[model samples]
Target: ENRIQIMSTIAKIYRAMSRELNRRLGELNLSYLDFLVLRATSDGPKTMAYLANRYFVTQSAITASVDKLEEMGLVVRVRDREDRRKILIEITEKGLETFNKGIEIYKKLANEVTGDLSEDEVILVLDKISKILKRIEEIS
Candidate 1:
């Protein structure tokens, strides 16, 4: 019963967050997956394989999304100087600008959702989530 309740609550939260992000992102001409890509690459350029693994998606899916982003001038694909066969996905100045704007929206929504929580409460939730994620990784 406890497991079922936790799973159901998690699903509800995920659906609500997805809906909120999608609605907000649509205004910026970005999808949730696009934002995820941008966020994942924010630190540095990433290989297509890395992104595919990180997002748990197929190479073709990453290719399709990258193609769209390239068309929008938000991302660029560059050949690695060391290896001709290696390609890296990088964000452009325009991509950074757009990503920043989109992140603001995300932060605002996140704050709205969690702002009322006390620090201890937040920590408790984080601890549980971390354990759950660790369990998933172990199983996978």
Candidate 2:
């Protein structure tokens, strides 16, 4: 068996998914990375440092991303309730609505993409993926 083919298959899957999602995200005026940032801040406020670490991006990189998000009225910077020096990013109501819609699109697409696979197979695939990425997740 050619194990290398499995790596090729994984790369192609992401390539296809990214293309489709990029188009969908474009309609909503969001880049794929922007959508992910919106998702990260949707739940509640998070410090800029936290988001940078969470996404494995540089501090200024996230700062630039947040600047766009804020200009779009998708997020806001606020001082932490108890910590004056800590500025947190909070999702606006509009941001929440956008995130919810994106979630629907993502869910439908994901369901369709995996529709042919049996649940058991999907679980095993996900388990393998988790194992493969566990080290990166831990280090990040």
Top candidate (lDDT)? 1
lDDT of 2 by residue, 53-118 (tens): 877788888888889889999998988678878788899999999888888888888999999999
Error of 2 at 36 (Å): 0.9
Residues 2-110, candidate 1: write the lDDT tens digits.
9879878989988999999999998988888888788877779988899888888898988888888889999999997888788889999999998999999999998
TM-score of 1: 0.88
TM-scores, all candidates, are 0.88, 0.79
Measured with C-alpha atoms, the lDDT of residue 104 in candidate 1 is 98
Provide C-alpha RMSD values for all models, in order: 1.8, 2.6
Clashes of 1: 0
lDDT of 1: 0.89
